[PDB]
């Protein structure tokens, strides 16, 4: 069984050149979802807000498929995210390098699906004026591929509701609304669309 | 005997592929324990508390066994933690990357036992309201595998009492209680359990 797993990873990783990424010929769908744990900083003097969240990313590669009957009925495995291609999904309005709070390990299943869920702390541009009011304030940050268009990486969500079930119970802030919305941008010059997921969080100081 | 150790480490690390991690067929037990040194920061404006502790992890691998009689009676050795697989035990509610305060060196025994005790500084989510009262305040943070279920990594403690024997004598805070306790979570959808160790620290400003 441990022999079988070693063999599986050998066959998948050492045998082949690494996946060079998607193309318009062989595009890829990346599914994105956020789990908000807390709003950990609000800075009105510089208009910066810090979030801590889990970012779930899922995609599927034919080059990561195998037949379980051929590997002692192994149906999935975990591996360092360094061992595989991962997508270049990025926050477009960060003000500091994102900090990774969890191990970077992905789960690969025999149908070629990969799921990767890094915990992260993000600083991003947001004027928090009104957070200390009843109306609260809305912040937004877009996530999308840094170099691939919508003809190469299609971005999708499973739900437009940010998962709040793990939001810190004694947080300084109350979340009034938290959504994640697929948006498509078209430019006059060009036929290819560009895709982002818009993370929109409305919140206020708890009273 | 220096030659023998070189030969042992050669035989253990260079001969075989890396341990690919545990599976449902060949699960693994990780024993976790904390030695709390100080509460080094309490931030009521962001609800962040910082701890400094030693985190002891212990597990056992068949692939790390040897016969001392074949190696000049060597019964154990120390090696860089980078030379071996280590478990992905993670704080689930940190707010910053954990900082490592000590060398990362593991102790390996001929029965395949591994012990690794890194000093760490952790920032995590905690509303410290009540810290300056006689009642004090309770903070909690869960530790668990980021990607393995309880059918693959079983987490346990040797004791539910956090080791306070080295807690800083002139600390700003008094520890009222500190426990490290195995907890289990079940989901109806899925047969495998999920395990965490809950580090719960009740403390107050010293008067």
């Amino acid at each position: 069984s441990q022999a079988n797993l070693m063999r599986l990873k050998s066959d998948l990783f050492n045998r082949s050149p690494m996946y060079p990424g998607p193309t318009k010929d062989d595009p890829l769908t990346v599914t994105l979802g956020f789990t908000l744990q807390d709003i950990v900083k609000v800075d009105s003097s510089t208009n910066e807000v810090d979030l801590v969240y889990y970012e779930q990313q899922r995609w599927k590669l034919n080059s990561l498929m195998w037949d379980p009957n051929e590997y002692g009925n192994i149906t999935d495995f975990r591996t360092s995210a360094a061992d595989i291609w991962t997508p270049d999904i990025t926050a477009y309005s960060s003000t500091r390098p994102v900090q990774v709070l969890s191990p970077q390990i992905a789960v690969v299943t025999h149908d070629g699906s990969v799921m990767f869920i890094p915990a992260q702390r993000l600083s991003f541009m947001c004027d928090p004026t009104g957070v200390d009011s009843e109306e609260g304030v809305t912040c937004a940050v877009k996530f999308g591929s840094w170099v691939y268009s919508g003809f190469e990486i299609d971005l999708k969500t499973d739900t437009d509701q940010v998962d709040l079930s793990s939001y810190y119970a004694s947080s300084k802030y109350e979340i009034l609304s938290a959504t994640q919305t697929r948006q498509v941008q078209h430019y006059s010059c060009c036929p290819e669309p560009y895709i982002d997921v818009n993370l929109v969080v409305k919140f206020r100081e708890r009273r | 005997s220096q030659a023998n150790l070189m030969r042992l480490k050669s035989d253990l690390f260079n001969r075989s592929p890396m341990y690919p991690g545990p599976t449902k067929d060949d699960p693994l037990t990780v024993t976790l324990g904390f030695t709390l040194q100080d509460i080094v920061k309490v931030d009521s404006s962001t609800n962040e508390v910082d701890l400094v502790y030693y985190e002891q992890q212990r597990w056992k691998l068949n692939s790390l066994m040897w016969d001392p009689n074949e190696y000049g009676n060597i019964t154990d050795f120390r090696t860089s933690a980078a030379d071996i697989w280590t478990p992905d035990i993670t704080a689930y509610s940190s707010t910053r990357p954990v900082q490592v305060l000590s060398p990362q060196i593991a102790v390996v025994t001929h029965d395949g036992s591994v012990m690794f005790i890194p000093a760490q500084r952790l920032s995590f989510m905690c509303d410290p309201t009540g810290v300056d009262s006689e009642e004090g305040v309770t903070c909690a943070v869960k530790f668990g595998s980021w990607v393995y279920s309880g059918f693959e990594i079983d987490l346990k403690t040797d004791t539910d009492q956090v080791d306070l024997s080295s807690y800083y004598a002139s600390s700003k805070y008094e520890i009222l209680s500190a426990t490290q306790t195995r907890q289990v979570q079940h989901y109806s959808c899925c047969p495998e359990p999920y395990i965490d160790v809950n580090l719960v620290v009740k403390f107050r400003e010293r008067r």
Binding site: T35, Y54, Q56, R58, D76, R78, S102, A106, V107, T109, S113, M115, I117, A119, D163, S165, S166 | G144, S145, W146, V147, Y148, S149, Q185, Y187, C189, C190, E192, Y194
Partner: peptide, 16 residues
Amino acid sequence: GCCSHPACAGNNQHIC
């Protein structure tokens, strides 16, 4: 729920 737990989500991708 399961999908809020990263280890559970990664282990049950057909649900999460």
